[PDB]
Structure 1
Amino acid sequence: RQWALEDFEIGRPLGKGKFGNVYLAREKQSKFILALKVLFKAQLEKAGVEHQLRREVEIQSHLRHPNILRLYGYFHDATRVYLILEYAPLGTVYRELQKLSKFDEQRTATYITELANALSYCHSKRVIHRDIKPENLLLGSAGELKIADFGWSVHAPSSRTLCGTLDYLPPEMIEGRMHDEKVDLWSLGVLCYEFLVGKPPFEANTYQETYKRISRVEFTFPDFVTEGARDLISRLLKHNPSQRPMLREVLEHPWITANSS
């Protein structure tokens, strides 16, 4: 299926990516609405992450799950690569958080459940996402959560490419050790905290300070966080990955059970 730019009407920018913007688009013959993720070849090769784009396309295009953003295909011209994505109409969880400041236990527990199901599907194929953060979690038309942006994804066992914000990454990842599916379990913990609290647990004004905080696993909870939430988060944010629970154990955690829709 050989798409070209001329097959689409392009609309407003949906968001700012690292290598270009994502655009709302409509396919001219079908009137199918979708999102077009633009990446400038010059910038990709300079950054030396052409392998990340390849992985994104190959991994994301084969995954089929209601809580994973579909990638339908891709094309390119002289200066740009274009990923054809499922359009997520309700935007990002990042925007949702900045709108609401923090989520109640019901919305949080529900998003964690959707995330845990999507991750169960991924890990079953040994695909680890490694970049689960609010800006890569999109919302479908029913408000259902969708994992997107599989550029950091890899098949497990893996090493690590250079980084960005460290906030959502486990110690093994930042330190460049070998790592596996348990990476995403840590990230789930960070997200549960951020959804409840409004900021990630290792937030600091410096990368170096964040790194220290993550490596020592130093975080505390505001008083409003409940004991069930604390219990879940404390179980997920373990320095030793082998001590992190399996996703099954998260899905059946009493706090998740009592609060998830």
Structure 2
Amino acid sequence: KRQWALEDFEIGRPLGKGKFGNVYLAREKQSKFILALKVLFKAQLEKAGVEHQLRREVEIQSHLRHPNILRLYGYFHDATRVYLILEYAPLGTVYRELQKLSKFDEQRTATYITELANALSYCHSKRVIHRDIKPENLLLGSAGELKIADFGWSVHAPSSRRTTLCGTLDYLPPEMIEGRMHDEKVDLWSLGVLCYEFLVGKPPFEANTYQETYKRISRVEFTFPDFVTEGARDLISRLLKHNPSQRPMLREVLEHPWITANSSK
């Protein structure tokens, strides 16, 4: 492996914030390699009681190798902080891309879905379920390719509430939020949420209250603006099924006619 430490890196502009520490642009001093350094404060992690998510992220994300999964290269720590050494995603997040464009055309959407579906096929083949697929955790590489990041919630499938609790529920399926056993099908529901948000500019169960979002998800109550096409409606409506077993496999998504006609391969 190789024991890094702080002074191995020049730190740059803050790329952004998370709950437990910012991510920073960094350059390794000897190679000039540009990467991102995710800082987590130990104090805050222990208090929140999620250090196992950290171990999981590191163990899981460092062994995955897929062009649409963000690489984790390693980690180090000092007294107050843990530092994850990540692949740098130069075009930013899909969240920012959505706030910039408001919503995506069917080509950009279908293409992102395809990249997501491929990355997820790779993950589910190892029974790794991400569980936190949302636009803030989807990054863009230099060619604009999508990269799944932030594997802190990920786990090997079958799993049950596996951590503490919650925050934004928008992207989570009814099994998850209700704390029932769940498996790969979780990420299929999320894909459905994403496809709607990309096309519509807001997630389909958006509400002004957690408790109201919960209700909407649990009853699967959503509607489509008129501009959304029948092919997109058909994909989304197949993904957003309350019963996981009724959700398609990823292969079926990849070969969906709407995806086939719109995706840039």
**TM-score, structure 2 as length reference:** 0.98
Shift of 1:18: 1.1
Q: For 1:154 and 1:233, how far apart are their aligned partners in 2?
A: 25
Deviations 1:109-165 (A, max 9, x none): 000000000000000000000000000000000000000000000000000x21110
Structure 1: which 4+ aligned runs deviate by more than 3 Å?
none
In the alignment of these two chains, the number of paired residues is 260
Shift of 1:172: 0.1
Q: For 1:183 and 1:86, how far apart are their aligned partners in 2?
A: 26
Shift of 1:250: 0.0
Q: For 1:197 and 1:238, how far apart are their aligned partners in 2?
A: 19
Shift of 1:224: 0.1
Q: For 1:88 and 1:15, how far apart are their aligned partners in 2?
A: 12
Match of 1:169 in 2: 172
- The answer to whether the aligner puts 1:144 opposite 2:154 as a matched pair is no
Shift of 1:92: 0.0
Deviations 1:42-72 (A, max 9, x none): 0000000000000000000000000000000
Match of 1:127 in 2: 128
Deviations 1:65-119 (A, max 9, x none): 0000000000000000000000000000000000000000000000000000000
- The answer to whether the aligner puts 1:210 opposite 2:205 as a matched pair is no
- The answer to whether the aligner puts 1:257 opposite 2:260 as a matched pair is yes
Q: For 2:135 and 2:46, how far apart are their aligned partners in 1?
A: 26
Shift of 1:15: 1.1
The runs of 5 or more residues in structure 2 that have no matched partner are none
Q: For 1:114 and 1:45, how far apart are their aligned partners in 2?
A: 34
Shift of 1:207: 0.1
Structure 2 residue matching 1:17: 3-state secondary structure = coil
Structure 1 residue matching 2:187: 3-state secondary structure = helix
Match of 2:239 in 1: 236
Q: Considering only aligned residues, what root-mean-square deviation do their CA atoms show, in Å?
A: 0.2
Shift of 1:17: 1.1
Structure 2 residue matching 1:18: 3-state secondary structure = coil
Q: For 2:118 and 2:101, how far apart are their aligned partners in 1?
A: 24
Q: For 1:174 and 1:154, how far apart are their aligned partners in 2?
A: 16
Structure 1 residue matching 2:66: 3-state secondary structure = coil
Shift of 1:211: 0.1
**Identical-residue share of aligned pairs (%):** 100
- The answer to whether the aligner puts 1:220 opposite 2:209 as a matched pair is no
Structure 1 residue matching 2:103: 3-state secondary structure = coil
The runs of 5 or more residues in structure 1 that have no matched partner are none
Deviations 1:167-201 (A, max 9, x none): 00000000000000000000000000000000000
